[PDB]
Amino acid sequence: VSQVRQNYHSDCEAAVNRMLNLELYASYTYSSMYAFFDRDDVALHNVAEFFKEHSHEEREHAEKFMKYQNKRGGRVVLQDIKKPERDEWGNTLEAMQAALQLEKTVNQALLDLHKLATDKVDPHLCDFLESEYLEEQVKDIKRIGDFITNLKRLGLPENGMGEYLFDKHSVKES
Amino acid sequence: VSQVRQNYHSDCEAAVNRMLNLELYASYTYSSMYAFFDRDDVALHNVAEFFKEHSHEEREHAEKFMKYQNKRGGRVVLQDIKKPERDEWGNTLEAMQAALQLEKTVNQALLDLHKLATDKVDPHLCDFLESEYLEEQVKDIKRIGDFITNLKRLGLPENGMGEYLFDKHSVKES
Amino acid sequence: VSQVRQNYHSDCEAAVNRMLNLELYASYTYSSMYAFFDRDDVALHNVAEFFKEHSHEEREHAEKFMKYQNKRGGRVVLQDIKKPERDEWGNTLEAMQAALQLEKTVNQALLDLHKLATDKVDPHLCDFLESEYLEEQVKDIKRIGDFITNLKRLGLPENGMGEYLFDKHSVKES
Amino acid sequence: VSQVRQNYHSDCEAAVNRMLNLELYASYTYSSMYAFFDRDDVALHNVAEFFKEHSHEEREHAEKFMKYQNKRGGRVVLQDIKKPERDEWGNTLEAMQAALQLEKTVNQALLDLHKLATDKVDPHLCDFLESEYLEEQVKDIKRIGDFITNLKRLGLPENGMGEYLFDKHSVKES
Ligand SMILES: [Cl-]
Ligand SMILES: [Cl-]
Ligand SMILES: [Cl-]
Ligand SMILES: [Cl-]
Ligand SMILES: [Cl-]
Ligand SMILES: [Cl-]
Ligand SMILES: [Cl-]
Ligand SMILES: [Cl-]
Ligand SMILES: [Cl-]
Ligand SMILES: [Cl-]
Ligand SMILES: [Cl-]
Ligand SMILES: [Cl-]
Ligand SMILES: [Cl-]
Ligand SMILES: [Cl-]
Ligand SMILES: [Cl-]
Ligand SMILES: [Cl-]
Ligand SMILES: [Cl-]
Ligand SMILES: [Cl-]
Ligand SMILES: [Cl-]
Ligand SMILES: [Cl-]
Ligand SMILES: [Cl-]
Ligand SMILES: [Cl-]
Ligand SMILES: [Cl-]
Ligand SMILES: [Cl-]
Ligand SMILES: [Cl-]
Ligand SMILES: [Cl-]
Ligand SMILES: [Cl-]
Ligand SMILES: [Cl-]
Ligand SMILES: [Cl-]
Ligand SMILES: [Cl-]
Ligand SMILES: [Cl-]
Ligand SMILES: [Cl-]
Ligand SMILES: [Cl-]
Ligand SMILES: [Cl-]
Ligand SMILES: [Cl-]
Ligand SMILES: [Cl-]
Ligand SMILES: [Cl-]
Ligand SMILES: [Cl-]
Ligand SMILES: [Cl-]
Ligand SMILES: [Cl-]
Ligand SMILES: [Cl-]
Ligand SMILES: [Cl-]
Ligand SMILES: [Fe+2]
Ligand SMILES: [Fe+2]
Ligand SMILES: [Fe+2]
Ligand SMILES: [Fe+2]
Ligand SMILES: [Fe+2]
Ligand SMILES: [Fe+2]
Ligand SMILES: [Fe+2]
Ligand SMILES: [Fe+2]
Ligand SMILES: [Fe+2]
Ligand SMILES: [Mg+2]
Ligand SMILES: [Mg+2]
Ligand SMILES: [Mg+2]
Ligand SMILES: [Mg+2]
Ligand SMILES: [Mg+2]
Ligand SMILES: [Mg+2]
Ligand SMILES: [Mg+2]
Ligand SMILES: [Mg+2]
Ligand SMILES: [Mg+2]
Ligand SMILES: [Mg+2]
Ligand SMILES: [Mg+2]
Ligand SMILES: [Mg+2]
Ligand SMILES: [Mg+2]
Ligand SMILES: [Mg+2]
Ligand SMILES: [Mg+2]
Ligand SMILES: [Mg+2]
Ligand SMILES: [Mg+2]
Ligand SMILES: [Mg+2]
Ligand SMILES: [Mg+2]
Ligand SMILES: [Mg+2]
Ligand SMILES: [Mg+2]
Ligand SMILES: [Mg+2]
Ligand SMILES: [Mg+2]
Ligand SMILES: [Mg+2]
Ligand SMILES: [Mg+2]
Ligand SMILES: [Mg+2]
Ligand SMILES: [Mg+2]
Ligand SMILES: [Mg+2]
Ligand SMILES: [Mg+2]
Ligand SMILES: [Mg+2]
Ligand SMILES: [Mg+2]
Ligand SMILES: [Mg+2]
Ligand SMILES: [Mg+2]
Ligand SMILES: [Mg+2]
Ligand SMILES: [Mg+2]
């Protein structure tokens, strides 16, 4: 047993490792989207930079779980980071739709971890999730939903001018 | 009788209370428009912020009538603030059309109050309306009319790209 | 269904709308208190400004619920804002007593919303209430209770000198 | 006829001269109040300074009428400035009551001048009164009424401690 361990259930420790893997998976998916939008035959560089920055965010999310695990006296156990579901992402609308689904998948895993922490009466883990993960998740989901609404308004997928305009006005210029 | 009261007719006092209520009603309508444009399936955030700021303006307009009432020795009497006419506002053009009508309704009430103040020979109240309300009303009506002309030019309601562009270029970025 | 909606029960959505209305109601009550203490025959201007600032706080509380509703994919539904219970507020002690009761009513509604969110297993909503509402509520209740104790010490309602002194020393000079 | 004169009725010219005299009379009354509160057996120096500053205000009000008269091509005609109604002013409450009555007398004369200017179709004179006199009059009347309410609350005339406290907290320290 770790000398620091107190009120930390084995099931929660394992679920934190799984959650860490999922954050790394999400990071990798966003990296793939970055590379796609940087292609010379796609060439939407503000969209590309948006996904690059989200990839970095998710890796920070993973590292925070590593630190958490050690703070509680659990042990980090790593697994393969699965490659993303797709090799090419279609266009800005398809990518944003995939990002929305990914963020909801991550959110569901966080909510499931909260239910486990609640069942094991671990208020520190509940607070960690509520204070460091759940709200930023809701914010990201809202932002991406707002983008999807605007991409549809702009006539995606068919309206190339609309897609061009989204890249200039909706995402930060990089 | 209030010790400060001088040349302040009961009818004017009552009309000031009614006008206060109408300003609060206008504020509430604009709040509703803000919330609508902030919806994830609407997502025109500069339009939303435009309406939020107008909601704050109208509440300031109401508070100025409260202060006026007390300065003259009248007594503030509040009534329910009626909910807005609609729960959803269609799109930027429909909302701006409703805003134009609302500002003209408020203007008509101000003009009617001026006619009452004139009939009761209350130059202080006439000056207050002319100096604090009537010109800003004309300016707001002109601004909203200009917006409606541009929304029609941009092909509203059908042209989603036009609506997107209005939000980026016509209203302040928030 | 909203594309962003996840783990957000219809009952919670409705309760958030009701809570929004209650915040607006509280704002309006405080506005009435402001106007009362600004009367020439009341004339306690620091007390008036205290209530004006609380009125603004409560409207900010309402707007935060609007934003919350949209972030979760719920839909803002507005109802009439009922006029305050009284047209005149007696004196500083009676007003502070009414304010204490109002803040406890608002607190009870927040606590009831927390119980609903708990029952529906909505940790995001629980966190929102705990992080943005519950503590500031306890602070406001404590502050008003402290004021009531001091108003009684100062001999309210009978001791006009005491009431005058409270306005100079207990509330911020405006 | 003056070369500048246009749309300026003889009756208005005469009424402006009378109004000038009344402003000078008001100034002189306030000077008397200043001197009274500076007496060693009265000794309320912030109250004294309040009245001194109002005396200066009223003399500025008179000089503005002189300038107005000349701008319109009328001719300033001066009369004796009558000494104030009283040689001694009792206490802060009695003085403030007399000041309220004086400000209402001045206000009534301004309103009567506005009615004359209206009857003679002189919009410049109406605007001058509305823009330079009527609102500041309402503000002064409200301020003095508020003071009277507080002096009564403080137990004037009998409560000397109350009178002392008013001088420290209600009027600017000089
Ligand atoms: Cl343990
Ligand atoms: Cl334990
Ligand atoms: Cl265990
Ligand atoms: Cl594991
Ligand atoms: Cl596998
Ligand atoms: Cl693929
Ligand atoms: Cl597509
Ligand atoms: Cl997914
Ligand atoms: Cl968070
Ligand atoms: Cl641009
Ligand atoms: Cl956008
Ligand atoms: Cl009257
Ligand atoms: Cl009159
Ligand atoms: Cl009347
Ligand atoms: Cl009324
Ligand atoms: Cl009704
Ligand atoms: Cl509707
Ligand atoms: Cl339309
Ligand atoms: Cl309307
Ligand atoms: Cl104006
Ligand atoms: Cl425009
Ligand atoms: Cl849901
Ligand atoms: Cl869930
Ligand atoms: Cl549901
Ligand atoms: Cl509802
Ligand atoms: Cl009802
Ligand atoms: Cl009442
Ligand atoms: Cl009481
Ligand atoms: Cl209550
Ligand atoms: Cl809080
Ligand atoms: Cl002090
Ligand atoms: Cl206190
Ligand atoms: Cl002439
Ligand atoms: Cl003419
Ligand atoms: Cl003439
Ligand atoms: Cl003359
Ligand atoms: Cl004489
Ligand atoms: Cl005398
Ligand atoms: Cl007396
Ligand atoms: Cl007089
Ligand atoms: Cl003025
Ligand atoms: Cl005072
Ligand atoms: Fe993440
Ligand atoms: Fe994410
Ligand atoms: Fe542009
Ligand atoms: Fe308004
Ligand atoms: Fe308006
Ligand atoms: Fe509140
Ligand atoms: Fe409150
Ligand atoms: Fe004057
Ligand atoms: Fe005066
Ligand atoms: Mg060991
Ligand atoms: Mg284990
Ligand atoms: Mg996994
Ligand atoms: Mg594989
Ligand atoms: Mg909890
Ligand atoms: Mg917390
Ligand atoms: Mg937080
Ligand atoms: Mg985030
Ligand atoms: Mg996240
Ligand atoms: Mg946004
Ligand atoms: Mg009275
Ligand atoms: Mg009446
Ligand atoms: Mg009405
Ligand atoms: Mg109704
Ligand atoms: Mg007329
Ligand atoms: Mg103007
Ligand atoms: Mg305006
Ligand atoms: Mg207006
Ligand atoms: Mg313009
Ligand atoms: Mg949809
Ligand atoms: Mg529902
Ligand atoms: Mg309710
Ligand atoms: Mg009712
Ligand atoms: Mg906190
Ligand atoms: Mg608070
Ligand atoms: Mg609160
Ligand atoms: Mg305290
Ligand atoms: Mg000549
Ligand atoms: Mg003449
Ligand atoms: Mg005279
Ligand atoms: Mg004489
Ligand atoms: Mg003015
Ligand atoms: Mg003045
Ligand atoms: Mg004056
Ligand atoms: Mg004041």
Ligand 34 ion: Cβ-proximal residues, 5 Å cutoff: D 7
| Feature table: binding site of C for Fe cation | 23, 58, 61, 103, 137, 140
| Feature table: binding site of A for Fe cation | 23, 58, 61, 103, 137, 140
Provide the shortest C-alpha distance from residue C23 to chain D (in Å): 32
Q: What distance in Å separates the CA atoms of residue C121 and residue C8, rounded to the nearest whole number?
A: 9
Q: Residue C31: its chain B contacts at CB < 8 A?
A: 63, 66, 78
Q: What distance in Å separates the CA atoms of residue A110 and residue A21, rounded to the nearest whole number?
A: 12
Chains A and D touch (3+ CB pairs under 8 A): no
Q: What distance in Å separates the CA atoms of residue C103 and residue C23, rounded to the nearest whole number?
A: 10
Instruction: Using DSSP, state whether D37 is helix, strand or coil.
Output: helix
CA distances from A48 to A40, B83, D74 (A): 12, 44, 77
Q: What is the DSSP code string of A6-50?
A: -S--HHHHHHHHHHHHHHHHHHHHHHHHHHHHTSTTT--HHHHHH
Percent helix, percent strand, percent coil in chain D, to nearest 5: 70, 0, 30
Q: Are B132 and B60 in contact (CB under 8 A)?
A: no
Token couple for B152: 């029609």
Q: What distance in Å separates the CA atoms of residue B25 and residue B84, rounded to the nearest whole number?
A: 7
Q: Are A11 and A116 in contact (CB under 8 A)?
A: yes
Closest partner residue to A138 (CB to CB) among C3, C72, C121 is C72
Chains B and A touch (3+ CB pairs under 8 A): yes
Q: What distance in Å separates the CA atoms of residue A100 and residue A143, rounded to the nearest whole number?
A: 9
Q: Are A32 and A85 in contact (CB under 8 A)?
A: no
Task: Count Cβ atoms within 10 A of the Cβ of residue D124 and give its class: 0-12 exposed, 13-18 middle, 19 or more buried.
Answer: middle
Provide the shortest C-alpha distance from residue B137 to chain A (in Å): 32
CB atoms within 10 A of CB C80: 14
Q: What are the residues whose beta carbons fall under 8 Å from the beta carbon of C69, sequence distance 6 or more?
A: B35, C13, C16, C17, C20, C75, C76
CB pairs under 8 A between A and C: 40
Residue found under tokens 């409207």: C59
Provide the shortest C-alpha distance from residue C140 to chain A (in Å): 24
Ligand nearest to the CA of B82: 65
Q: What distance in Å separates the CA atoms of residue B133 and residue D44, rounded to the nearest whole number?
A: 42
Task: Count Cβ atoms within 10 A of the Cβ of residue B30 and give its class: 0-12 exposed, 13-18 middle, 19 or more buried.
Answer: buried
Token couple for D54: 């109002």
CB contact, 8 Å: C79 with chain A? no
Q: Residue A135: its chain C contacts at CB < 8 A?
A: 124, 127-128
Taking only Cα atoms into account, the Rg of chain C, rounded to an integer number of angstroms, comes to: 18
Residue B84: name the closest of B147, B18, B30 by CA.
B30
Ligand 25 ion: Cβ-proximal residues, 5 Å cutoff: C 14, 17, 77
Residue of B nearest to C33 (CA): B76
- Mark residue D43 as left, alpha or beta (left: phi above 0; alpha: psi -120 to 50; beta: remaining): left
- The torsion defined by the Cα of A109, A113, A114 and A116, in degrees rounded to 10, comes to 140
Residue A147: name the closest of A128, A161, A167 by CA.
A167
Q: What distance in Å separates the CA atoms of residue D134 and residue D143, rounded to the nearest whole number?
A: 14
CB contact, 8 Å: D161 with chain C? yes
- D140 is an annotated ligand-binding site residue: yes
- Tell me the technique behind this structure: X-ray
CB pairs under 8 A between C and D: 34
- Amino acid sitting at position A13: E
> How many Cα atoms within 13 Å fall on the side-chain side of residue D81?
15
Ligand nearest to the CA of A165: 45
| D84: DSSP letter | P
CB contact, 8 Å: B60 with chain C? no
Q: Are D55 and D27 in contact (CB under 8 A)?
A: yes
Query: Which residues face C81 on adjacent strands?
Result: B81
Closest partner residue to A145 (CB to CB) among B40, B45, B163 is B40
Residue of B nearest to C1 (CA): B41
CB contact, 8 Å: C2 with chain A? yes
Q: What distance in Å separates the CA atoms of residue B57 and residue B54, rounded to the nearest whole number?
A: 5
Distance D19 CA to ligand 83 centre (A): 20
Ligand nearest to the CA of D5: 33
Q: Residue A138: its chain C contacts at CB < 8 A?
A: 71-72, 124
Chains C and B touch (3+ CB pairs under 8 A): yes
Set out the domains of chain B in order of their start, with CATH numbers.
1-174 (1.20.1260.10)
CB contact, 8 Å: C165 with chain D? yes
In the stretch 120-139 of chain C, residues with CB closer than 8 A to chain A read 121, 123-124, 126-128, 131
Token couple for D143: 């301020």
Cis previous bond, D157, omega within 30: yes
Q: What distance in Å separates the CA atoms of residue D111 and residue D103, rounded to the nearest whole number?
A: 12
CB contact, 8 Å: B87 with chain A? no
Residue of A nearest to C123 (CA): A130
| Feature table: binding site of A | 23, 58, 61, 103, 137, 140
Q: In residues, how long is chain D?
A: 174
Provide the shortest C-alpha distance from residue D127 to chain B (in Å): 9
Q: Residue A167: its chain B contacts at CB < 8 A?
A: none
CA distances from C58 to A47, C19, C127, C171, D162 (A): 39, 11, 19, 18, 36
CB contact, 8 Å: B69 with chain C? yes
Q: Are B29 and A135 in contact (CB under 8 A)?
A: no
CB contact, 8 Å: C60 with chain B? no
CA distances from A170 to A150, B44, D174 (A): 9, 11, 58
Q: What are the residues whose beta carbons fall under 8 Å from the beta carbon of A44, sequence distance 6 or more?
A: A37, A92, A163, A164, A167
Q: What distance in Å separates the CA atoms of residue C96 and residue B4, rounded to the nearest whole number?
A: 27
